[PDB]
Ligand binder design. Structure first.
Ligand SMILES: CC(C)Oc1ccc(C2=CC=CN3CCS(=O)(=O)N=C23)cc1
Ligand SMILES: N[C@@H](CCC(=O)O)C(=O)O
Ligand SMILES: N[C@@H](CCC(=O)O)C(=O)O
Ligand SMILES: [Zn+2]
Ligand SMILES: [Zn+2]
Ligand SMILES: [Zn+2]
Lengths: 260, 260
């Protein structure tokens, strides 16, 4: 038996550096929802594992010209990792090159505003110009807008792709900071899960507004032909059915929420 | 090549007989969310198909003594149908014997009451005995309560399994009728999708109360070894991303609303 290499991403509250990480070793350096989930998946499937943080800090996209996959998807496609346990969105283009388990969490694209921003919906954002808006610069949210045929989102993509300066951000943290420092003049499009988490964090100056734009899931991903595929899929189902996944969401989102 | 036999279930608004069904033939007799979904999946996967209503009128459970599966699950397991396109809940015990596509719709177990029934949560139901409560037979909701170790749900099952007269019903229609005729003395445990639909239909005398008890999905199911498995899975993802699944929910839930 070989130790399973797990690719993941520093994204709060999924995977975070522990405050005393420099004094700890291996998997013990990290904490969060996905750290807890990895330990359980490994236990139920009967494997030893090593958490690794994706080298380029990205989720996964295929470059238009080079056809090279980056991010966690790349690590799986190119054989650098055996499994991805992360807030990695199940999409058709990804499912064509890797396998996903059944989803372990639901989400949809959503709008983050600085409190008091006169925006209720995606329609509102598309109808006006004073408030800028954007997405994570690589990921499923950007691709949703790029590939969309619905009029509001098509109009939104047409604005976003040509906006100057760039409305796209390198990390979720950068998007959140931009909202917080822009005095209501920037709104951020991000997954409801991350939006909901930030809403419960000091300085309690952001909120989710409106309905989700779509409905999808995060899944645990393996390269095609992985011997882990079946066991991992069944483990996610078992953990959902036994109430663990709901427990972990409560633990990391709400139990220690900082906004009352 | 060969006409694909689709097993499905008469369940509003997934598969319903059209008002003028007696003067109609084959697939044309039926309408609903899953009728539309089957047409789309067939188109993208390039097959012809025959919709057939499950013989025993059940979703599917395994007899504890004989180990024989019934319902749509049994029809797949024993080779009577090629695919199930229905509101069929993805579960561990089912995933062990059949394959499921990625989910096409999210749901959770929920409570249906007659309007004015003094009940707000599962906790509320468990703490009393004047209001009876039950679930559908041979489905995933029953299994949830049978298997649950969460104290509220365990107490609910202990009551439910022994209650006299029986609190379990054969069909959703039977559960709904029981609520409507029991003058507030029966509450029904059913999936949020079905509950929300019924709440928007005449005579507008029921409602969903409390949050969902769990979070899960319906999937398209195929027998193990099926040549359709990959194409069906990819087609479900295609339809979600194209916005078609969202259009279909709006068509069959919101647009069919009768209660203003
Ligand atoms: C925890 C999990 C069991 O709850 C979920 C998560 C997501 C879905 C889901 C719903 C609708 C569409 N899609 C698109 C394919 S998806 O991205 O695989 N998931 C969905 C359902 C239930
Ligand atoms: N979960 C996304 C990243 C975040 C986003 O795009 O909003 C992905 O897998 O690409
Ligand atoms: N969707 C359920 C049936 C409805 C229920 O059990 O509430 C199943 O697949 O068994
Ligand atoms: Zn466990
Ligand atoms: Zn289509
Ligand atoms: Zn297609």
């Amino acid at each position: 038996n070989k130790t399973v290499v797990v690719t993941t991403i520093l994204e709060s509250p999924y995977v975070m550096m522990k405050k005393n990480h420099e004094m700890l070793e291996g998997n013990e350096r990290y904490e969060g929802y996905c750290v807890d989930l990895a330990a359980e998946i490994a236990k139920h499937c009967g494997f030893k594992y090593k958490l690794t943080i994706v080298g380029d800090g990205k989720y996964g996209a295929r470059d238009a010209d080079t056809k090279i996959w980056n991010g966690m998807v790349g690590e799986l496609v190119y054989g650098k990792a055996d499994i991805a346990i992360a807030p990695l969105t199940i999409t058709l283009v990804r499912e064509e090159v890797i396998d996903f388990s059944k989803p372990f969490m639901s989400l949809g694209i959503s709008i983050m505003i600085k409190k008091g921003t006169p925006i209720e919906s995606a329609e509102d954002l598309s109808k006006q110009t004073e408030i800028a808006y954007g997405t994570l610069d690589s990921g499923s949210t950007k691709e949703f807008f790029r590939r969309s045929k619905i009029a509001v989102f098509d109009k939104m993509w047409t604005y976003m792709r040509s906006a100057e300066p760039s409305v796209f951000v390198r990390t979720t943290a950068e998007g959140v900071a931009r909202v917080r420092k822009s005095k209501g003049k920037y709104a951020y499009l991000l997954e409801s899960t991350m939006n909901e988490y930030i809403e419960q964090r000091k300085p309690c100056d952001t909120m989710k507004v409106g309905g989700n734009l779509d409905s999808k899931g995060y899944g645990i991903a393996t390269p095609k032909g992985s011997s882990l595929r079946n066991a991992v899929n069944l483990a996610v189902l078992k953990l959902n059915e036994q109430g663990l996944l709901d427990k972990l969401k409560n633990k990391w989102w709400y139990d220690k929420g900082e906004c009352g």
